[PDB]
Amino acid sequence: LGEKWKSRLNALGKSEFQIYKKGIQEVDRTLAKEGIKRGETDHHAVSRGSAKLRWFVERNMVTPEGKVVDLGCGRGGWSYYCGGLKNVREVKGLTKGGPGHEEPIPMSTWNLVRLQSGVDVFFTPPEKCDTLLCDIGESSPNPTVEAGRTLRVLNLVENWLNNNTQFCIKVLNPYMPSVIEKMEALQRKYGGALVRNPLSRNSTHEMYWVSNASGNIVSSVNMISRMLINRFTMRKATYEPDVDLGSGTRNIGIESEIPNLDIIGKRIEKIKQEHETWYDQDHPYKTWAYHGSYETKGSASSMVNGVVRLLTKPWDVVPMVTQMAMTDTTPFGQQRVFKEKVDTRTQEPKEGTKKLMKITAEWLWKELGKKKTPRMCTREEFTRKVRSNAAGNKWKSAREAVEDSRFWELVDKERNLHLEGKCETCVYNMMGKKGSRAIWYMWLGARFLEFEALGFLNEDHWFSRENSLSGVEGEGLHKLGYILRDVSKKEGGAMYADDTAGWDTRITLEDLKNEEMVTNHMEGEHKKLAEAIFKLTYQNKVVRVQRPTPRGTVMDIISRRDQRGSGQVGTYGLNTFTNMEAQLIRQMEGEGVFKSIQHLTVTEEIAVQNWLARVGRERLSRMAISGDDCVVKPLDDRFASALTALNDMGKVRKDIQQWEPSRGWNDWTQVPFCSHHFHELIMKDGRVLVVPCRNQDELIGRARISQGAGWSLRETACLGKSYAQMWSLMYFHRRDLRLAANAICSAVPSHWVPTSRTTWSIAKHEWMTTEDMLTVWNRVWIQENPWMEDKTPVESWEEIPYLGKREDQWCGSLIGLTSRATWAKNIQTAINQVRSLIGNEEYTDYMPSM
RNA sequence: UGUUAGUCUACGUGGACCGACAAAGACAGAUUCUUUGAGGGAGCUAAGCUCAACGUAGUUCUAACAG
Ligand SMILES: [Zn+2]
Ligand SMILES: [Zn+2]
Numbered sequence: 001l002g003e004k005w006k007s008r009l010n011a012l013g014k015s016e017f018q019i020y021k022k023g024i025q026e027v028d029r030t031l032a033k034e035g036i037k038r039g040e041t042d043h044h045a046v047s048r049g050s051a052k053l054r055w056f057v058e059r060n061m062v063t064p065e066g067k068v069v070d071l072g073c074g075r076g077g078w079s080y081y082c083g084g085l086k087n088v089r090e091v092k093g094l095t096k097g098g099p100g101h102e103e104p105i106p107m108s109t110w111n112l113v114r115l116q117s118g119v120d121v122f123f124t125p126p127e128k129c130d131t132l133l134c135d136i137g138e139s140s141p142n143p144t145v146e147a148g149r150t151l152r153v154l155n156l157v158e159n160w161l162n163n164n165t166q167f168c169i170k171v172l173n174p175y176m177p178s179v180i181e182k183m184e185a186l187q188r189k190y191g192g193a194l195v196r197n198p199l200s201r202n203s204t205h206e207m208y209w210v211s212n213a214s215g216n217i218v219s220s221v222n223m224i225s226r227m228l229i230n231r232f233t234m235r236k237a238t239y240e241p242d243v244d245l246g247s248g249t250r251n252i253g254i255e256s257e258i259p260n261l262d263i264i265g266k267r268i269e270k271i272k273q274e275h276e277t278w279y280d281q282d283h284p285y286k287t288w289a290y291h292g293s294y295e296t297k298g299s300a301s302s303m304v305n306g307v308v309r310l311l312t313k314p315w316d317v318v319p320m321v322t323q324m325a326m327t328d329t330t331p332f333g334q335q336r337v338f339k340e341k342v343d344t345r346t347q348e349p350k351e352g353t354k355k356l357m358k359i360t361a362e363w364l365w366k367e368l369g370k371k372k373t374p375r376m377c378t379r380e381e382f383t384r385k386v387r388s389n390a391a392g393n394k395w396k397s398a399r400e401a402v403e404d405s406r407f408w409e410l411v412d413k414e415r416n417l418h419l420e421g422k423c424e425t426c427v428y429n430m431m432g433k434k435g436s437r438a439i440w441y442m443w444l445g446a447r448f449l450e451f452e453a454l455g456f457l458n459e460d461h462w463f464s465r466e467n468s469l470s471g472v473e474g475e476g477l478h479k480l481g482y483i484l485r486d487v488s489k490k491e492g493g494a495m496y497a498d499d500t501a502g503w504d505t506r507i508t509l510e511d512l513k514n515e516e517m518v519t520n521h522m523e524g525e526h527k528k529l530a531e532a533i534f535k536l537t538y539q540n541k542v543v544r545v546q547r548p549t550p551r552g553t554v555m556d557i558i559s560r561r562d563q564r565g566s567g568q569v570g571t572y573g574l575n576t577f578t579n580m581e582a583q584l585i586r587q588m589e590g591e592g593v594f595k596s597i598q599h600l601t602v603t604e605e606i607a608v609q610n611w612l613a614r615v616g617r618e619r620l621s622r623m624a625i626s627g628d629d630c631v632v633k634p635l636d637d638r639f640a641s642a643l644t645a646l647n648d649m650g651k652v653r654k655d656i657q658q659w660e661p662s663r664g665w666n667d668w669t670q671v672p673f674c675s676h677h678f679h680e681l682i683m684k685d686g687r688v689l690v691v692p693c694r695n696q697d698e699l700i701g702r703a704r705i706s707q708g709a710g711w712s713l714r715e716t717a718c719l720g721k722s723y724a725q726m727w728s729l730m731y732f733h734r735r736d737l738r739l740a741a742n743a744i745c746s747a748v749p750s751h752w753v754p755t756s757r758t759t760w761s762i763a764k765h766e767w768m769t770t771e772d773m774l775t776v777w778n779r780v781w782i783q784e785n786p787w788m789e790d791k792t793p794v795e796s797w798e799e800i801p802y803l804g805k806r807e808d809q810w811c812g813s814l815i816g817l818t819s820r821a822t823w824a825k826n827i828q829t830a831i832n833q834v835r836s837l838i839g840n841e842e843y844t845d846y847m848p849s850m
Numbered sequence: 851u852g853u854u855a856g857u858c859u860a861c862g863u864g865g866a867c868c869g870a871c872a873a874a875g876a877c878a879g880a881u882u883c884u885u886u887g888a889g890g891g892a893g894c895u896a897a898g899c900u901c902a903a904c905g906u907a908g909u910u911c912u913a914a915c916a917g
Contacts, residue, residue: 014853014916022914029914037912048914100851100917138917203915684878735876801878808876815876816884824877850877 002175002205002225003143008232009204010141021203023236027051031242040657041108042247047077049135049170051199052208054081054243058332058339059549060282061195061210062168064088066130071121071157072096076104078133083113084250086286094119096136108657111249122152126159131166139172139204147176154182163190169209174221183209183217193217196224199240202231241434244340247658254348259289259559263540266424268292271544271557280556282549287345288558296546296555299333300433302326303706306713307720310834311743314736314814314823315700324701331548333434338545341502342438346562346650352600353648354510356588359605360581361514363612368467369521374456376526382451385458385569389708389757393429401444410445418449418529423536430543438504442567446537450567453530454518457573469620470580472627472674473573476764477730478784481678481690484624484631488668492622492633495671496640496664501654503575503628504564508650511578512538512565538565575627582649583623583630584612589645590634597648624673626761631673640664674761679811681733683801685792689781691733696812699727699737707757717748717838718756724748725767726758728846729777733803736813736820742847743827745773747834749841773846797847 012020032046056062065087072095073079079093090112095104097118104115121136134153139146150173161167173179174194187193194207194217205228268291272278275294283290304325315321386398401407417423426446430438442450457463464474472480487495500506516534519527541560546553566574588594593611594604624631632639640662647658656663670677676692683689703723706716724741731737753770766780774794782791794800802808805815814820823830827849
């Protein structure tokens with residue numbers, strides 16, 4: 001049956017073979033090449049078997065625990081993937097080695113992994129193991145030779161397997177009579193079946209002999225044979241996300257967090273009372289202790305931005321914009337992200353680092369407390385802060401809960417209980433977002449007390465540059481660019497920009513003990529509620545998360561005593577404060593103060609305190625920090641190599657191996673702050689300006705994403721208009737971008753007031769106004785620059801310049817190609833066609849077409 | 851051992867510009883820039899060099915792979 005398939009498989013041309021191997025679900029390998037070349041020894045792997053193992057493991061087709069015997073590691077994919085699992089006691093690897101064979105490259109993804117390279121698996125006498133993995137195999141343009149290889153491997157491992165032994169063998173010759181007969185003999189005694197992994201590539205008929213099943217392989221063989229017969233004359237190229245693998249050495253000390261019961265007993269009783277009609281043994285958690293589950297009824301739905309899409313004809317064929325705009329729906333993505341990043345444990349710091357963080361937070365709160373004071377907020381402000389598109393366990397909306405009138409009856413008892421530092425309902429709910437970071441919601445009744453406790457941060461502006469000197473609040477995009485323009489004038493060296501990976505999951509237990517110091521200045525019932533919320537909730541998080549197994553979609557509860565401790569709204573300021581602290585400690589390591597981070601003494605503590613109290617404002621002025629992002633201008637060139645105190649805290653940086661040298665910029669035009677780089681432009685009026693910029697394909701694609709739940713066309717047109725307005729008021733230095741903005745504004749009717757969402761990191765969102773764009777441009781980009789003394793109004797758009805061709809093509813463009821020429825020539829046709837497609841109202845001209 | 855895109859090491863073919871000449875991109879319109887030929891081949895020739903456009907033969911390497 002399969003001999004014709006094998007004969008025609010080697011009868012294909014080599015070029016067509018390479019084209020045909022990659023339409024299936026192939027995981028991305030673009031970053032794997034960088035990881036090999038740049039020398040990253042952790043994070044995303046390179047072996048194609050790792051994706052197959054990930055697919056098989058999460059559905060419990062295999063149960064890898066106890067003793068592990070591997071038969072060939074390739075580059076180390078199977079060995080290192082299972083080296084970090086919770087219950088894998090020992091990892092033993094024997095690579096065939098020698099010339100002509102695939103050889104593993106040492107990595108640091110391994111404490112219990114022992115590799116003896118250069119030894120065939122046939123040199124080893126028959127030994128029994130808990131779970132065995134088989135990968136080694138060579139395909140040749142003769143089926144008999146690979147059949148003999150399969151026969152010899154099966155004959156060797158025949159004495160190795162038993163009923164108790166788990167196994168994952170990748171069968172390379174599953175369609176020959178003798179191997180099939182032997183497999184049938186084995187499956188009638190031990191169990192396991194031949195299944196094709198959809199993540200396996202179509203290089204050949206590679207099957208997997210699974211152990212968590214006992215069905216007959218006949219149907220699977222027939223189905224896969226038919227599918228691969230009809231795949232030759234098929235009537236695609238998609239990438240799946242690369243599975244995170246973490247880094248470091250596994251330890252048995254911090255494994256799992258003990259769930260304290262005297263705080264969550266009533267909460268779990270309340271959770272159980274919801275169904276009572278409620279455990280499971282298919283949970284993959286190793287750091288989240290399960291306590292209950294209940295049967296319940298995919299990922300975030302992506303909506304295309306049609307208005308932007310129609311007018312971006314030159315970018316209709318670029319794959320990046322399309323893939324960022326097209327629908328991406330999978331029924332496993334949420335739990336995929338959950339297991340790859342949130343389920344991972346965090347290495348805890350040591351006494352020296354935690355003490356340094358403790359004293360740094362004390363100094364910082366000493367400094368900011370002398371110019372501000374927390375205030376007891378009021379009820380009316382809570383509804384006033386209902387901005388953004390989320391404006392929504394009965395009900396789910398904020399507006400409805402106010403008029404439900406049960407809200408006060410619920411919150412009264414909680415307010416009374418929070419007086420004495422006791423609580424009963426402070427639960428969370430997390431779901432949705434491909435992103436790789438966690439988003440936290442909160443109960444709206446709990447949201448009310450969270451607001452009444454810590455809502456002063458978003459209004460009193462503790463983190464404004466007046467009291468922060470490094471924050472983003474109180475400083476617009478133009479003002480941030482101006483500050484970056486003055487940082488260069490300030491004496492110093494290189495400008496360093498970094499983006500730490502997994503910031504939310506890397507926040508340790510000690511860090512949450514720094515925010516409690518805000519209770520120092522509070523008083524009365526506000527202080528009592530602050531202490532109660534800081535103790536009862538900020539150190540004990542209950543999360544209800546889904547698991548859609550073939551047995552059903554079950555929501556289960558899990559308790560963790562680490563990571564972020566707030567919702568989606570207050571997280572910004574707290575994260576910014578922690579990031580200022582982290583930048584301060586990293587600079588302290590760079591300059592050189594402490595000679596040992598394992599241990600400390602009073603003298604170093606008081607010296608650090610004096611240094612902080614002396615030059616804290618000066619050091620804060622030099623750094624520009626927004627959320628998890630931070631750009632730094634230190635006073636030394638040795639700032640790059642000081643990473644020991646940085647990774648002692650437990651921060652992991654992506655795009656590079658953790659212990660490799662840092663990356664910085666001596667050019668301030670390409671320093672990414674707030675995920676954007678600033679260009680300087682010279683205009684005819686004798687004054688200088690600054691503008692944001694990035695990969696224009698990224699900007700267009702972000703303009704091509706529509707968010708939310710439920711949608712229409714008017715809001716899409718408003719999105720297009722708002723994107724165009726923001727482009728004109730911020731990115732006016734570009735040709736393609738400004739052309740698109742003036743054509744979308746010329747297409748969407750201007751009688752519709754723009755009130756929509758652009759991003760999440762937007763002060764002074766000027767691009768939601770129906771005013772004349774020239775007027776607002778005049779007011780924001782001439783009047784609002786205190787360095788300018790000659791205010792020269794412009795009554796036409798011929799004055800506003802662009803950048804030269806070199807920088808335009810450097811930051812990504814289409815000038816110098818016939819596509820840009822066609823788009824510029826056909827601006828009339830595109831404008832008219834989108835005007836006809838959207839609607840016809842009285843338009844407002846903002847630029848001449850030519 | 852190949853498939854597929856590049857590349858350090860060699861030298862030669864061949865060069866650093868002239869405009870109210872012509873044509874095509876950059877639509878902020880400049881001393882406009884860039885690009886190709888017709889006429890000068892900058893009295894008039896040319897290796898060496900700073901670079902690399904072109905080529906022939908690597909005992910030069912990696913890269914989805916391949917065997
Ligand atoms: Zn509570
Ligand atoms: Zn740019």
